[PDB]
Amino acid sequence: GARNSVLRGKKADELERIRLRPGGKKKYRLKHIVWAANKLDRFGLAESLLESKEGCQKILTVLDPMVPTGSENLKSLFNTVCVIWCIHAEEKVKDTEGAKQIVRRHLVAETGTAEKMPSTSRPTAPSSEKGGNY
Structure with a gap:
């Protein structure tokens, strides 16, 4: 909504350094961020989440299950969101x-603690249903 450029000086040095392929000559660019952001808008998610570790994490969880229920046009995004989050978690690739x-490794670690199911999620709110319509 404000400013013109979001990428930082040092941060950019890392993003522009990352290559789209393992042995290719193509690197990440704003072009890839746009196509990604536009998707979040239509999908139903926010765009500001692309500039926040906590935000990107909420997006990956949505595109996660989309893999087994999507095509290349979908996988591309999932592979793009995984790169953004890293930049926020201070991860060099x-x-x-x-x-x-x-x-991936960071996800499997979080999805591997279901051998107890501790009291984390708060219980259902105390709804007192008495009577009917007025």
């Missing part, structure tokens, strides 16, 4: 592939 791994 080399190629889209390497970045995808760093993220």
Whole structure:
């Protein structure tokens, strides 16, 4: 909504350094961010989440299940969001592939603590239903 450029000086040096492929010559650019942001808008998510670790994490969780229920046009985004989050979590990568791994490992670790199911999520609110319509 404000300013013209979002990428920083040092941060950019890392993004522009990352290559779209492991052995290719193409690197990440604003072009890829746009196509990604536009998707979040139509999909139903926010765009400001692309500039926040906590935000990008909320997006990956949505595109996660979209993999087994989407096509290349979808996988591309998922592989793009995994790169943005890293930049926010202070993770140095080399190629889209390497970045995808760093993220995956971080997810499997969080989805591997269901051997107890502790009291984390608050219970249903105390709804007192008495009577009917007026």
